[PDB]
């Protein structure tokens, strides 16, 4: 709905900015162990409930 506290809106903003894939150049580093973002979120799978 329309209403949300600004603090709640800011928490949802950070979750939106974290919902990104790993950059490709990360996988080319010398001792890299990261292949894909293991904390990817979908609004239909898992809820945040802020």
């Amino acid at each position: 709905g329309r209403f949300k506290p600004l603090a709640v809106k800011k928490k949802y903003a950070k979750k939106m900015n974290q919902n990104k894939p790993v950059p490709y150049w990360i996988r080319l580093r010398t001792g890299n162990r990261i292949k894909w973002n293991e904390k990817r979120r979908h609004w239909r799978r898992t809820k945040l409930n802020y």
């Binding site: 600004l6 809106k9 800011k10 949802y12 903003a13 950070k14 939106m16 900015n17």
Partner: protein, 96 residues
């Protein structure tokens, strides 16, 4: 005073105004609405955005419309007075 850190009064406007936006919507407002679009400090003020525009760019803002974007940043739609031309100051700013 228990605060002794040196704070400069001539750099406050640089924190108020962060950087302009160059999206397709932002470029449209420059031409037909004489309006510049900026990303501003999320805790800044419409009154303080107007004063920062005067200090940084020597232009007069007749209206400032603000919104907090879904990513958390604050964006300002700044209309300049008809005396100033938004395209001209956009060229001076460097966004063209």
């Amino acid at each position: 005073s228990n605060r002794v850190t040196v704070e400069s009064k001539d750099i406050a406007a640089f924190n108020v105004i962060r950087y302009p936006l160059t999206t397709d919507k932002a470029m449209k407002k420059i031409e037909e609405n004489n309006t510049l679009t900026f990303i501003v400090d999320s805790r800044a003020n419409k009154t303080e955005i107007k004063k920062a525009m005067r200090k940084l760019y020597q232009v007069k803002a007749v209206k400032v419309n603000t919104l907090i974007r879904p990513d958390g940043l604050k964006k300002a739609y700044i209309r300049l007075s008809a005396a100033h031309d938004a395209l001209d100051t956009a060229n001076k700013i460097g966004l063209v």
